[PDB]
Coordinates of C-alpha atoms and ligand atoms in Angstrom, one line a residue:
Chain A
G1 CA 10.8 0.6 21.3
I2 CA 10.4 1.0 17.5
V3 CA 8.0 3.9 17.7
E4 CA 10.4 6.1 19.7
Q5 CA 13.3 5.1 17.5
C6 CA 11.9 5.1 14.0
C7 CA 8.5 7.0 14.0
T8 CA 9.1 10.0 16.4
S9 CA 12.8 9.9 15.6
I10 CA 14.6 8.5 12.5
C11 CA 15.9 5.0 12.0
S12 CA 18.9 4.2 9.8
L13 CA 18.6 1.0 7.8
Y14 CA 20.8 -0.7 10.5
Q15 CA 18.5 0.4 13.2
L16 CA 15.4 -0.9 11.3
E17 CA 17.2 -4.2 11.1
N18 CA 17.3 -4.4 14.9
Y19 CA 13.6 -5.3 14.6
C20 CA 14.1 -8.3 12.4
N21 CA 13.8 -11.8 13.8
Chain B
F1 CA 17.8 3.7 2.0
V2 CA 15.4 6.5 3.0
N3 CA 16.2 8.6 6.1
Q4 CA 12.8 9.6 7.3
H5 CA 10.2 9.1 9.9
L6 CA 8.3 5.8 9.4
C7 CA 5.1 5.2 11.3
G8 CA 2.2 2.8 11.3
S9 CA 1.7 0.9 8.2
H10 CA 4.6 2.6 6.5
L11 CA 6.9 1.4 9.3
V12 CA 5.5 -2.2 9.0
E13 CA 6.0 -2.2 5.2
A14 CA 9.6 -1.0 5.7
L15 CA 10.3 -3.9 8.1
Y16 CA 8.8 -6.4 5.7
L17 CA 11.2 -5.2 3.0
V18 CA 14.3 -4.9 5.2
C19 CA 13.8 -8.2 7.1
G20 CA 13.0 -10.5 4.3
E21 CA 12.6 -14.2 5.1
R22 CA 13.6 -13.5 8.7
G23 CA 10.4 -11.7 9.5
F24 CA 10.1 -9.1 12.2
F25 CA 8.2 -8.0 15.2
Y26 CA 6.2 -4.7 15.4
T27 CA 5.6 -3.8 19.1
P28 CA 4.3 -0.2 19.3
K29 CA 3.7 -0.1 23.0
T30 CA 7.3 -1.0 23.8
Chain C
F1 CA -1.2 -20.6 -6.4
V2 CA -0.6 -17.5 -4.4
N3 CA 2.5 -15.3 -4.7
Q4 CA 3.9 -15.5 -1.1
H5 CA 5.9 -12.4 -1.3
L6 CA 3.0 -10.2 -2.4
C7 CA 0.7 -12.0 0.0
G8 CA 3.0 -11.4 3.0
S9 CA 3.2 -7.7 2.2
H10 CA -0.5 -7.5 2.2
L11 CA -0.8 -9.6 5.4
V12 CA 1.4 -7.4 7.5
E13 CA -0.6 -4.3 6.6
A14 CA -3.7 -6.2 7.6
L15 CA -2.1 -7.2 10.9
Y16 CA -1.1 -3.6 11.6
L17 CA -4.8 -2.7 11.4
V18 CA -6.2 -5.7 13.2
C19 CA -3.6 -5.9 16.0
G20 CA -3.3 -2.2 16.7
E21 CA -1.5 -1.4 19.9
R22 CA -0.9 -5.1 20.7
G23 CA 1.5 -5.4 17.8
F24 CA 2.5 -8.7 16.2
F25 CA 5.3 -11.0 15.2
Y26 CA 5.5 -11.8 11.5
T27 CA 7.2 -15.2 11.1
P28 CA 6.7 -16.4 7.5
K29 CA 8.9 -19.5 7.8
Chain D
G1 CA 1.8 -20.6 10.1
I2 CA 0.2 -17.4 8.8
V3 CA 1.5 -17.8 5.2
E4 CA 0.1 -21.4 5.1
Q5 CA -3.2 -20.3 6.5
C6 CA -3.8 -16.8 5.1
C7 CA -2.2 -16.9 1.7
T8 CA -3.9 -20.0 0.5
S9 CA -7.3 -18.8 1.8
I10 CA -8.6 -15.4 2.8
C11 CA -8.4 -15.0 6.6
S12 CA -11.2 -13.0 8.3
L13 CA -10.3 -10.3 10.8
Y14 CA -11.0 -12.9 13.5
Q15 CA -8.5 -15.4 12.0
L16 CA -5.9 -12.7 11.5
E17 CA -6.2 -11.7 15.2
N18 CA -4.6 -15.1 16.1
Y19 CA -1.3 -13.6 15.0
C20 CA -1.4 -10.6 17.1
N21 CA 0.6 -10.4 20.4
Chain E
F1 CA -8.4 -3.2 16.0
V2 CA -6.5 0.1 15.7
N3 CA -8.0 3.2 17.3
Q4 CA -6.6 5.9 15.2
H5 CA -7.4 8.5 12.5
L6 CA -7.8 6.9 9.1
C7 CA -7.8 9.1 6.1
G8 CA -7.6 8.8 2.3
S9 CA -6.1 5.6 1.0
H10 CA -5.5 4.3 4.5
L11 CA -9.3 4.7 5.3
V12 CA -10.2 2.9 2.0
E13 CA -7.8 0.1 2.8
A14 CA -9.3 -0.3 6.3
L15 CA -12.8 -0.5 4.8
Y16 CA -11.6 -3.2 2.3
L17 CA -10.3 -5.3 5.2
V18 CA -13.2 -4.7 7.5
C19 CA -16.0 -5.2 5.0
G20 CA -14.8 -8.3 3.2
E21 CA -17.0 -9.8 0.5
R22 CA -19.7 -7.2 1.3
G23 CA -17.8 -4.4 -0.1
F24 CA -18.2 -0.8 1.0
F25 CA -18.8 2.8 -0.1
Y26 CA -16.3 5.6 0.3
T27 CA -18.2 8.9 0.1
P28 CA -15.8 11.8 1.2
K29 CA -18.1 14.7 0.4
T30 CA -20.9 13.4 2.6
Chain F
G1 CA -20.0 11.2 6.7
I2 CA -17.0 8.9 6.9
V3 CA -14.4 11.7 6.8
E4 CA -15.9 13.5 9.8
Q5 CA -16.4 10.3 11.8
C6 CA -13.1 8.4 11.0
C7 CA -10.6 10.8 9.6
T8 CA -10.9 14.0 11.6
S9 CA -12.3 11.9 14.5
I10 CA -11.7 8.2 15.4
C11 CA -13.9 5.3 14.3
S12 CA -14.1 2.2 16.3
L13 CA -14.3 -1.1 14.3
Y14 CA -18.1 -1.1 14.7
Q15 CA -18.2 2.5 13.3
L16 CA -16.1 1.5 10.3
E17 CA -18.5 -1.4 9.7
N18 CA -21.3 1.2 9.2
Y19 CA -19.8 1.9 5.8
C20 CA -19.9 -1.7 4.5
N21 CA -22.6 -2.7 2.0
Chain G
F1 CA -5.4 -16.4 -13.0
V2 CA -5.5 -13.4 -10.8
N3 CA -5.7 -13.4 -7.0
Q4 CA -9.0 -11.6 -6.5
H5 CA -8.3 -10.6 -2.9
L6 CA -5.0 -8.9 -3.7
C7 CA -6.4 -7.5 -6.9
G8 CA -9.3 -5.9 -5.0
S9 CA -7.0 -4.3 -2.5
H10 CA -5.1 -2.7 -5.3
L11 CA -8.3 -1.6 -7.1
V12 CA -9.7 0.3 -4.2
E13 CA -6.5 2.3 -3.8
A14 CA -6.7 3.1 -7.5
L15 CA -10.3 4.1 -7.2
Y16 CA -9.4 6.4 -4.3
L17 CA -7.0 8.3 -6.6
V18 CA -9.2 8.2 -9.7
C19 CA -12.5 9.1 -8.1
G20 CA -11.2 11.7 -5.7
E21 CA -14.0 13.7 -4.1
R22 CA -16.7 11.8 -6.0
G23 CA -16.0 8.7 -4.0
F24 CA -17.1 5.2 -5.1
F25 CA -18.9 2.0 -4.2
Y26 CA -16.8 -1.2 -4.2
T27 CA -19.1 -4.1 -5.0
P28 CA -16.9 -7.2 -5.7
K29 CA -19.8 -9.7 -6.0
Chain H
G1 CA -18.4 -5.9 -12.3
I2 CA -15.1 -4.3 -11.5
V3 CA -13.5 -7.6 -10.4
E4 CA -14.5 -9.2 -13.7
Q5 CA -13.3 -6.3 -15.8
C6 CA -10.3 -5.0 -13.9
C7 CA -8.7 -8.1 -12.3
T8 CA -8.6 -10.1 -15.5
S9 CA -7.2 -7.2 -17.5
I10 CA -5.6 -3.9 -16.5
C11 CA -8.1 -1.1 -16.5
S12 CA -6.9 2.3 -17.6
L13 CA -7.7 5.4 -15.5
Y14 CA -10.6 6.0 -17.9
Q15 CA -12.0 2.5 -17.4
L16 CA -11.6 2.8 -13.6
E17 CA -13.6 6.1 -13.7
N18 CA -16.7 4.1 -14.6
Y19 CA -16.8 2.8 -11.0
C20 CA -16.7 6.3 -9.4
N21 CA -19.9 7.9 -8.0
Chain I
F1 CA 3.5 -16.9 -13.0
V2 CA 3.6 -13.5 -11.4
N3 CA 0.9 -10.8 -12.0
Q4 CA 3.2 -8.1 -13.5
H5 CA 0.8 -5.2 -12.7
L6 CA 0.6 -6.1 -9.0
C7 CA 4.3 -6.9 -8.9
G8 CA 5.2 -3.5 -10.4
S9 CA 3.0 -1.6 -7.9
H10 CA 4.9 -3.4 -5.1
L11 CA 8.3 -2.8 -6.7
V12 CA 8.0 0.9 -7.0
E13 CA 7.1 1.2 -3.3
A14 CA 10.2 -0.9 -2.5
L15 CA 12.3 1.4 -4.7
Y16 CA 10.9 4.4 -3.0
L17 CA 12.3 3.0 0.3
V18 CA 15.6 1.6 -1.0
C19 CA 16.5 4.6 -3.2
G20 CA 15.5 7.4 -0.9
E21 CA 16.8 10.7 -2.0
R22 CA 18.5 9.3 -5.1
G23 CA 15.2 8.5 -6.7
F24 CA 14.7 6.1 -9.5
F25 CA 13.4 5.5 -13.0
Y26 CA 10.7 2.8 -13.4
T27 CA 10.9 1.4 -16.9
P28 CA 8.8 -1.8 -17.0
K29 CA 9.1 -2.4 -20.8
Chain J
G1 CA 14.8 -5.2 -16.8
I2 CA 13.4 -4.8 -13.3
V3 CA 10.2 -6.7 -14.1
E4 CA 12.1 -9.6 -15.6
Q5 CA 14.5 -9.8 -12.7
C6 CA 12.3 -8.8 -9.7
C7 CA 8.9 -10.2 -10.5
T8 CA 10.0 -13.7 -11.4
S9 CA 12.2 -13.9 -8.3
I10 CA 12.4 -11.8 -5.1
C11 CA 15.1 -9.2 -5.3
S12 CA 17.0 -8.4 -2.2
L13 CA 17.5 -4.8 -1.1
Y14 CA 20.9 -5.0 -2.7
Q15 CA 19.5 -6.2 -6.0
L16 CA 16.8 -3.5 -5.9
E17 CA 19.4 -0.8 -5.4
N18 CA 20.6 -1.4 -9.0
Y19 CA 17.5 0.4 -10.2
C20 CA 18.1 3.6 -8.2
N21 CA 19.5 6.7 -9.8
Chain K
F1 CA -8.7 12.5 -10.1
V2 CA -7.8 13.6 -6.6
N3 CA -6.6 17.1 -6.0
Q4 CA -4.4 16.7 -3.0
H5 CA -0.8 16.8 -1.8
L6 CA 1.0 13.5 -2.7
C7 CA 4.3 12.7 -1.0
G8 CA 6.6 9.8 -0.7
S9 CA 5.2 6.4 -1.4
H10 CA 1.8 7.9 -2.1
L11 CA 3.3 10.1 -4.8
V12 CA 5.1 7.1 -6.3
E13 CA 1.9 5.0 -6.3
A14 CA 0.0 7.8 -8.1
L15 CA 2.7 8.0 -10.8
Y16 CA 2.5 4.2 -11.2
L17 CA -1.2 4.4 -11.8
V18 CA -1.1 7.5 -14.0
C19 CA 1.8 6.5 -16.2
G20 CA 0.9 2.9 -17.0
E21 CA 3.2 1.0 -19.4
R22 CA 5.2 4.2 -20.0
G23 CA 6.7 4.1 -16.5
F24 CA 7.9 7.2 -14.8
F25 CA 10.8 8.8 -12.9
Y26 CA 10.8 9.8 -9.2
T27 CA 13.5 12.4 -8.6
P28 CA 13.0 14.0 -5.2
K29 CA 16.1 16.0 -5.0
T30 CA 15.3 17.9 -8.3
Chain L
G1 CA 10.9 19.1 -9.4
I2 CA 8.1 16.7 -8.4
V3 CA 8.3 17.4 -4.7
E4 CA 7.8 21.1 -5.0
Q5 CA 5.1 20.7 -7.6
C6 CA 3.1 17.8 -6.2
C7 CA 4.0 17.2 -2.5
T8 CA 4.4 20.7 -1.0
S9 CA 2.0 22.1 -3.7
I10 CA -0.8 20.2 -5.6
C11 CA -0.5 18.5 -9.0
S12 CA -3.3 18.2 -11.4
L13 CA -3.5 14.9 -13.2
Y14 CA -1.9 16.6 -16.2
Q15 CA 0.9 17.8 -14.0
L16 CA 1.5 14.3 -12.7
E17 CA 1.7 13.1 -16.2
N18 CA 4.7 15.3 -16.8
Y19 CA 6.7 12.8 -14.8
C20 CA 5.8 9.8 -17.0
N21 CA 8.4 8.5 -19.5
Ligands
LIG1 CL1 9.6 -6.0 0.0
LIG2 CL1 -0.5 -8.2 -4.9
LIG3 CL1 -5.9 -10.4 4.5
LIG4 CL1 0.5 8.8 5.3
LIG5 CL1 -7.8 -7.2 3.7
LIG6 CL1 -5.6 -0.8 -11.5
LIG7 CL1 10.4 -6.4 -3.6
LIG8 CL1 -2.4 1.3 -10.9
LIG9 ZN1 12.5 14.5 12.2
LIG10 ZN1 9.1 13.3 8.9
LIG11 ZN1 9.0 -6.8 -2.0
LIG12 ZN1 -0.4 -6.3 -3.8
LIG13 ZN1 -4.1 10.7 14.4
LIG14 ZN1 0.4 6.9 4.2
LIG15 ZN1 -6.6 -8.9 3.0
LIG16 ZN1 -7.4 12.5 17.4
LIG17 ZN1 -2.7 18.1 2.0
LIG18 ZN1 -3.4 -0.7 -11.0
LIG19 ZN1 -2.2 22.6 0.2

């Protein structure tokens, strides 16, 4: 999920975009 | 773009910016 | 009239607080 | 939608909760 | 509602949302 | 005060409401 | 005219910074 | 009140300080 | 029309995220 | 300027990047 | 004014408030 | 720079003002 990927680890812009609709 | 840990409201704000008119979903328990 | 872009920015912060662990979908259109 | 309902008028906490998962 | 530690500006924003037209007081040295 | 209750400890919604006017 | 709800959200953040340890009361009405 | 004075016009830091405790 | 003061507050947060380590100058006038 | 371009209309991430160093 | 550590977006917001119409520069790698 | 002065150390209001244009 997003917390594991972007909060306790770091999300690239491309990875943040995976959570867009 | 920043390369840093984004949590809580700061993560939601980042999604708002990145996703634009498409919107997004914030599911923290996933 | 309300600035939708600024309003939405505000709304998602409010949803973060209100929804908590349940999360939410933000679908403006 | 949330923009139609909560940008035009102020939504209370209870009205905002509708949009949660 | 979230169940988390709220400090500083994030605490003030939470009070703004929760309190509505009633307003609130933020007294950190109390 | 609010810092002890909600910042170094956790406030329920009802506890945050104690700081409303 | 200014959106009072968005304005107030902004104002309390500014007061947090300006007032510091003194704190403040936010009384919109 | 603060809304009447600082929403209509931009309040400087000095004007905002009036509202502090 | 858009509230420039609220808009700018929002813009600098967006620039923080977009610019990252590069930083930015915010020159409204 | 950024206010003229990004307050009137919504600037995309790509348009915002112009203002970075 | 607060006497505290200001980082990231919170630092940028503080500069926006403090600097007014003058604007500011946020250079984190300096 | 600003990070060393105000983020990993504390900036007085006067020190934050050094970063204004
Ligand atoms: Cl944005
Ligand atoms: Cl706004
Ligand atoms: Cl709201
Ligand atoms: Cl934070
Ligand atoms: Cl709110
Ligand atoms: Cl202000
Ligand atoms: Cl933007
Ligand atoms: Cl400000
Ligand atoms: Zn890390
Ligand atoms: Zn980190
Ligand atoms: Zn934006
Ligand atoms: Zn705003
Ligand atoms: Zn915590
Ligand atoms: Zn924060
Ligand atoms: Zn609100
Ligand atoms: Zn805890
Ligand atoms: Zn600190
Ligand atoms: Zn302001
Ligand atoms: Zn310290």
